Design an enzyme around this catalytic site. Sequence first.
Site, PDB file in Angstrom:
ATOM      1  CE  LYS A  69       8.484  -9.200  37.947  1.00 39.67           C
ATOM      2  NZ  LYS A  69       9.839  -8.708  37.554  1.00 39.67           N
ATOM      3  CE  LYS A  93       2.865 -10.701  28.502  1.00 39.27           C
ATOM      4  NZ  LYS A  93       4.155 -11.296  28.099  1.00 39.27           N
ATOM      5  CE  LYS A 105       7.535  -5.046  28.777  1.00 42.78           C
ATOM      6  NZ  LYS A 105       7.252  -6.493  28.914  1.00 42.78           N
ATOM      7  CB  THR A 189       9.845 -16.804  27.738  1.00 41.25           C
ATOM      8  OG1 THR A 189       9.850 -15.699  28.649  1.00 41.25           O
ATOM      9  CG2 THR A 189       8.947 -16.491  26.540  1.00 41.25           C
ATOM     10  CG  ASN A 220      16.760 -14.031  25.162  1.00 38.27           C
ATOM     11  OD1 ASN A 220      17.939 -14.389  25.002  1.00 38.27           O
ATOM     12  ND2 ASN A 220      16.416 -12.756  25.388  1.00 38.27           N
ATOM     13  CB  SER A 347       9.726 -12.592  36.545  1.00 38.50           C
ATOM     14  OG  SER A 347      10.618 -12.543  35.439  1.00 38.50           O
TER      15      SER A 347
HETATM   16  N1  LIG Z   1      10.647 -10.335  28.919  1.00 38.38           N
HETATM   17  C1  LIG Z   1      11.377 -11.396  28.556  1.00 38.38           C
HETATM   18  O1  LIG Z   1      12.329 -11.828  29.218  1.00 38.38           O
HETATM   19  C2  LIG Z   1      10.992 -12.096  27.276  1.00 38.38           C
HETATM   20  C3  LIG Z   1      11.462 -13.378  26.999  1.00 38.38           C
HETATM   21  C4  LIG Z   1      11.089 -14.010  25.825  1.00 38.38           C
HETATM   22  C5  LIG Z   1      10.254 -13.365  24.942  1.00 38.38           C
HETATM   23  N2  LIG Z   1       9.796 -12.107  25.195  1.00 38.38           N
HETATM   24  C6  LIG Z   1       8.912 -11.429  24.200  1.00 38.38           C
HETATM   25  O2  LIG Z   1       8.940 -12.166  22.995  1.00 38.38           O
HETATM   26  C7  LIG Z   1       9.531 -11.382  21.927  1.00 38.38           C
HETATM   27  C8  LIG Z   1      10.964 -11.810  21.720  1.00 38.38           C
HETATM   28  O3  LIG Z   1      11.708 -11.588  22.941  1.00 38.38           O
HETATM   29  P1  LIG Z   1      13.183 -12.188  23.032  1.00 38.38           P
HETATM   30  O4  LIG Z   1      13.642 -12.036  24.437  1.00 38.38           O
HETATM   31  O5  LIG Z   1      13.154 -13.553  22.447  1.00 38.38           O
HETATM   32  O6  LIG Z   1      14.013 -11.153  22.119  1.00 38.38           O
HETATM   33  P2  LIG Z   1      15.558 -11.066  21.685  1.00 38.38           P
HETATM   34  O7  LIG Z   1      16.008  -9.653  21.588  1.00 38.38           O
HETATM   35  O8  LIG Z   1      16.338 -11.972  22.568  1.00 38.38           O
HETATM   36  O9  LIG Z   1      15.548 -11.716  20.222  1.00 38.38           O
HETATM   37  C9  LIG Z   1      14.646 -11.149  19.239  1.00 38.38           C
HETATM   38  C10 LIG Z   1      14.680 -12.001  17.993  1.00 38.38           C
HETATM   39  O10 LIG Z   1      13.760 -11.441  17.026  1.00 38.38           O
HETATM   40  C11 LIG Z   1      14.478 -11.243  15.813  1.00 38.38           C
HETATM   41  N3  LIG Z   1      13.800 -10.212  15.032  1.00 38.38           N
HETATM   42  C12 LIG Z   1      13.822  -8.853  15.214  1.00 38.38           C
HETATM   43  N4  LIG Z   1      13.105  -8.200  14.332  1.00 38.38           N
HETATM   44  C13 LIG Z   1      12.580  -9.195  13.516  1.00 38.38           C
HETATM   45  C14 LIG Z   1      11.733  -9.148  12.392  1.00 38.38           C
HETATM   46  N5  LIG Z   1      11.245  -8.020  11.878  1.00 38.38           N
HETATM   47  N6  LIG Z   1      11.396 -10.328  11.814  1.00 38.38           N
HETATM   48  C15 LIG Z   1      11.882 -11.461  12.336  1.00 38.38           C
HETATM   49  N7  LIG Z   1      12.684 -11.624  13.382  1.00 38.38           N
HETATM   50  C16 LIG Z   1      13.000 -10.441  13.938  1.00 38.38           C
HETATM   51  C17 LIG Z   1      15.905 -10.946  16.266  1.00 38.38           C
HETATM   52  O11 LIG Z   1      16.857 -10.986  15.223  1.00 38.38           O
HETATM   53  C18 LIG Z   1      16.036 -12.084  17.275  1.00 38.38           C
HETATM   54  O12 LIG Z   1      16.108 -13.259  16.478  1.00 38.38           O
HETATM   55  C19 LIG Z   1       9.343  -9.923  22.352  1.00 38.38           C
HETATM   56  O13 LIG Z   1       8.044  -9.460  21.993  1.00 38.38           O
HETATM   57  C20 LIG Z   1       9.448 -10.013  23.883  1.00 38.38           C
HETATM   58  O14 LIG Z   1       8.791  -8.974  24.572  1.00 38.38           O
HETATM   59  C21 LIG Z   1      10.155 -11.466  26.350  1.00 38.38           C
END
Ligand SMILES: NC(=O)c1ccc[n+]([C@@H]2O[C@H](COP(=O)([O-])OP(=O)(O)OC[C@H]3O[C@@H](n4cnc5c(N)ncnc54)[C@H](O)[C@@H]3O)[C@@H](O)[C@H]2O)c1
Lengths: 415, 410, 410
Positions: A69, A93, A105, A189, A220, A347
């Site tokens: 997954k 996880k 992945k 999340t 997100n 998920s």
């Molecule tokens: N698999 C999923 O559905 C899921 C959901 C939530 C979080 N995550 C994990 O948490 C992290 C964030 O995921 P997401 O879905 O919230 O991403 P996203 O793409 O929706 O948003 C990313 C955020 O990080 C910011 N960002 C990017 N580079 C940055 C930097 N150098 N410094 C500060 N901010 C920065 C972007 O501008 C945005 O605010 C990732 O590591 C991701 O793998 C995954």
Amino acid sequence: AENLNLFTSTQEVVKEALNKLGYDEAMYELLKEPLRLLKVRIPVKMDDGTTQVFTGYRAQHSDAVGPTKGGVRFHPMVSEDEVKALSMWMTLKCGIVDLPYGGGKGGIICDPRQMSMGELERLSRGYVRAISQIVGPTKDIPGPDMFTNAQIMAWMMDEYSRMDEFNSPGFITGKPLVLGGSKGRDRATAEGVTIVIQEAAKKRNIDIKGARVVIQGFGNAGSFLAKFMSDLGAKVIGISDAYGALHDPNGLDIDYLLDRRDSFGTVTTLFENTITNQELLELDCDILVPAAIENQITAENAHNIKATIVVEAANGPTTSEATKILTERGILLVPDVLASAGGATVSYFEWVQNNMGYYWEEEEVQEKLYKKMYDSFEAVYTTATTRNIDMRLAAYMVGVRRTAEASRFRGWVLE
Amino acid sequence: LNLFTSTQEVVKEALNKLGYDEAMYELLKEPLRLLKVRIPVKMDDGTTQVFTGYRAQHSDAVGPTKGGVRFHPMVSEDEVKALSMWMTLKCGIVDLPYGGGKGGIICDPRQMSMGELERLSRGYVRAISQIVGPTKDIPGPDMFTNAQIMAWMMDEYSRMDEFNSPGFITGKPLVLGGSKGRDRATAEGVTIVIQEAAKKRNIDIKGARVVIQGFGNAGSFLAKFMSDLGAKVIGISDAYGALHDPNGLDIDYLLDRRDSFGTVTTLFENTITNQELLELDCDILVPAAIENQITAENAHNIKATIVVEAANGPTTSEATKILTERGILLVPDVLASAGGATVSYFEWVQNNMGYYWEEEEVQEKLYKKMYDSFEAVYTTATTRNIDMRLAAYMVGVRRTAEASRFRGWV
Amino acid sequence: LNLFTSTQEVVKEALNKLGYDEAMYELLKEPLRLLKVRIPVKMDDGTTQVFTGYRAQHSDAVGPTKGGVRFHPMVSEDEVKALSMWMTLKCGIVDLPYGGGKGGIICDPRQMSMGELERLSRGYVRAISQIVGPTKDIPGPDMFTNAQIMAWMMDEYSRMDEFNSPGFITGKPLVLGGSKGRDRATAEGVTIVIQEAAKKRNIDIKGARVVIQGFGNAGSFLAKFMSDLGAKVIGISDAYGALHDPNGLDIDYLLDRRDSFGTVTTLFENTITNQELLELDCDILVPAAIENQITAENAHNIKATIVVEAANGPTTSEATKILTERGILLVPDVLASAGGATVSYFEWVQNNMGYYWEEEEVQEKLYKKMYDSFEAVYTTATTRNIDMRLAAYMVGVRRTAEASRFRGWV
Ligand SMILES: NC(=O)c1ccc[n+]([C@@H]2O[C@H](COP(=O)([O-])OP(=O)(O)OC[C@H]3O[C@@H](n4cnc5c(N)ncnc54)[C@H](O)[C@@H]3O)[C@@H](O)[C@H]2O)c1
Ligand SMILES: NC(=O)c1ccc[n+]([C@@H]2O[C@H](COP(=O)([O-])OP(=O)(O)OC[C@H]3O[C@@H](n4cnc5c(N)ncnc54)[C@H](O)[C@@H]3O)[C@@H](O)[C@H]2O)c1
Ligand SMILES: NC(=O)c1ccc[n+]([C@@H]2O[C@H](COP(=O)([O-])OP(=O)(O)OC[C@H]3O[C@@H](n4cnc5c(N)ncnc54)[C@H](O)[C@@H]3O)[C@@H](O)[C@H]2O)c1
């Protein structure tokens, strides 16, 4: 220097986790690399009619507990090492939260912001056609990750379904509801991250109502988490962006920011009085939540962190030497493998609903999610204090146990 | 004494009392499919030994077939065929979407090593894989097979398939999709059937006089379970003798002083015979030792209101008829021990969804099945004025007969 | 890998540290005698079955050999050989005028009637009578055998002698010359060693902190004993978890919540893990459960002043080196469990005299035997600066090697 490689650093903790659990060297040899890694070249017809060929990855860490997954990543920095480490984290996880999964992945080296809707669709269909032989509802179940979303999941589900000649909702998660998605997928999340914040807050005797929290990232995870923290009564003292950060000791107007944040989770460019990201990690607060990218807390700044609690919503935000510096300073580190399992939990519910063809309501998803995040927090926290070890190593211990025991039971490692 | 021809007579008398015709007996008197295989195994000394294996599938009219695999030197074709039919009856008594299956290998597992048993388990799955799987025929543990053998068999099936198929086989370790609440399920079902038989005769367990034969796994647990219900356990017994206390035995003392092989009579001087233990006056007699213990010789002598069979086959045919026409409520083994098949089914359902129940949930689900099956058999027994064994067979076979007719097979 | 060759390695290392030549190991690495017999038995169906029996006599340098007879499907010649050598080591540790012996019959007593086991018991005595007897080789109970089987064997031997020979065999019923003070002999023995280990470390047992792992037969018994002496039993466990109370867990209340598999943990679920149970700070840790609980990963973090093995092999070799290096007093299981052999010996002495001891006298003598053994092993370990497990082995082999030299055998 410091080891910043996501893959080899993750290996080192898994190796220690397996040794402390009593396993033989052969179990580390079986788990240190994914059982399968498929590297693929994907041609896409571009809107200008030329052809581009994209490099994609699908890593399947371990099969032993069940189908693997994990999400698919569209980014120009996708490497084979990142995809493997991401894949190994998904094993841990799923273990911590006790899912019949191994970790998978995927990633595609591309810049999706430079591509049209139609080019993204054809890239997404190509990726499924390139890897279809080793994925599916009973083998390997992809999903969204940063910069990929429900529309991309819908496209990938459609392409897999046309090949099978029948609907396979269970191939991929994060689907739209009308395509057999699950309630609660968007907030899963950050809702999981909110539960471990509340549980960590109880340990440390911090009242959430009035708690100063700081969040790096406004995507997100970041933006959903800021909303949850805000109307839980916390003061979200700072939020961050790929381009800057905002700071308000009274706590920021998160509703104002949510109304003006774009789909890519950037909002800082609208303001003049910005503060840097390296400043945001260091301002005084009670909870620091890195929810952007990897290796934001390193050896150069882990002493300068003023939070009592740091919880990792993002994958791999703090390095190996940072975790040791933090835990020596008395910080309550909640590792990513624990704190972000909420997304893998929901998920998995989507997949369970697809297997049965019957779908659950918000309150039922929330009920089952809370049980898992609550019970799994105690497990990791109890292990850390009972074995006098850091929280990450303990989370790895808790997360790797099912895979090791299954690999043993199945004959993959004898004795 | 032949099991298989004796099993056929069970099916024939039940179909005949249900009103089905000769054609239906002919369809059910033999398995639809019986696969005999020869499995070469590389032995630890480098010689190839070749083993005979069997897999019977009785009727799949109602669903995929279900039944365990045993590794015994005395496994035969007739044994496997008969037990697949008994599996059909067991599944239907507790109303599962299952027909009966069964497998066996001729070997002496106690004389083989770990590596040899794994290689034989794998070669067995290879040999039969064309007719088995989560939707066709689901094996499980039996004599001299356990969760580790199920784990090897599952891994082999899943490699052949190129994906995880935990629903192929039941009795798996938890980390491979096994079901919580699996170890106690058979004994807990005897507990429900005991308490449900007691209500039918309005016999309050607390203060009731109960004697149980045997003091091993089944007997230890049943003597402790009724002693904590406040019941007076006036008798328990051994292969070597029996104990009798009209005021109730100190079960916690016997429990404490028993040795690891289910013996405890040996410590004692004043001792009564097993034959006298069975004939004690009591409310509930629970045979939990061995077969052919109540026979035409002592069937008129046992003075229990309720006889629940925890052992397999402890009452003979003629003794069963003598017991029913003395008014005694006899719960047959094939109903009393249906907790194990029910939880096998629960494991397979969990594998189908990919979602796994908590122990409290399996118990809840297990209790209703037993409560419901007991009532189905009890009602058939009393409506048709038959003994509960034949009534259990009738409840056991009728789904397969009904399904065979609907599907056009007769 | 294999028990016999692993037992050969123990005898070799002990003789080496004592300073004997390679000849002494060549004499002791295999039993002096080994009798393999075939025994025909009339079965209840009238057929004849031929069983394989073994009697191993390791060394009679010190006196007649001593060891029990097990009826198990897995009995093997190497197992009987190796266990006889272990009986030499046991008899040495507690200073008995005995050498090591052992027997076994390949059967499944579970598929045999009372009459089949008697006829087999008599046929085994018949088959080995030429080399056993009160003054040669004295059997006893073991796996699947008991006082009734000892009564049959003693009768067969006496019939053969034409006079009563109670000292042929121990574990007899009291009415045939068995010993009082026998039933809990092994458990009382651990109790003595715990107290004697406690006085060495100058620890008052009457307020000491005691942690016991396991809550079946042995764990339940040890806990009630420590509770009664005034010790605070701050931890117990079973297979499903552990309980912790820093001031004393209230054993009498737990012994009432036991479920007949020795489980109490499931009722609370304000529970601690087994891992944490073992690293709780205390004075006396007692692993009375399974094996390999104290390991290289564990042993650096155990906090007990004293570790008394009340199960077989709960501490690994790696772990044993570490507890010795950290200054923890470790009582090996081969010493702490010697009370069963000691009281076997007392039954033989009483048979020799025709005079029989009260329960109190058997207890007094058992304590002195167990104290003296503990003292002897502690002095060997402390004088040579080695771990107590190697010292125990050395005391156990020492008498036989000294006698073998003295009588000219080497
Ligand atoms: N698999 C999923 O559905 C899921 C959901 C939530 C979080 N995550 C994990 O948490 C992290 C964030 O995921 P997401 O879905 O919230 O991403 P996203 O793409 O929706 O948003 C990313 C955020 O990080 C910011 N960002 C990017 N580079 C940055 C930097 N150098 N410094 C500060 N901010 C920065 C972007 O501008 C945005 O605010 C990732 O590591 C991701 O793998 C995954
Ligand atoms: N939980 C259950 O209720 C359950 C489940 C499966 C099977 N069984 C049946 O129960 C019986 C015992 O199973 P178990 O696991 O308890 O076995 P076990 O071997 O653990 O215990 C058997 C007991 O029966 C005694 N015994 C043997 N022969 C005897 C004889 N001739 N007369 C009187 N007592 C005798 C033994 O000495 C021992 O006390 C078998 O017939 C078996 O098929 C019960
Ligand atoms: N039948 C055989 O082949 C066989 C084999 C070995 C020993 N034995 C005999 O069995 C008896 C054993 O006595 P006992 O006191 O050990 O009692 P027991 O076996 O009845 O109970 C042992 C206790 O240890 C617990 N336990 C199991 N795994 C555990 C774990 N991982 N952590 C903690 N606790 C755990 C059990 O639940 C129980 O509380 C002795 O008589 C011995 O000679 C028989």
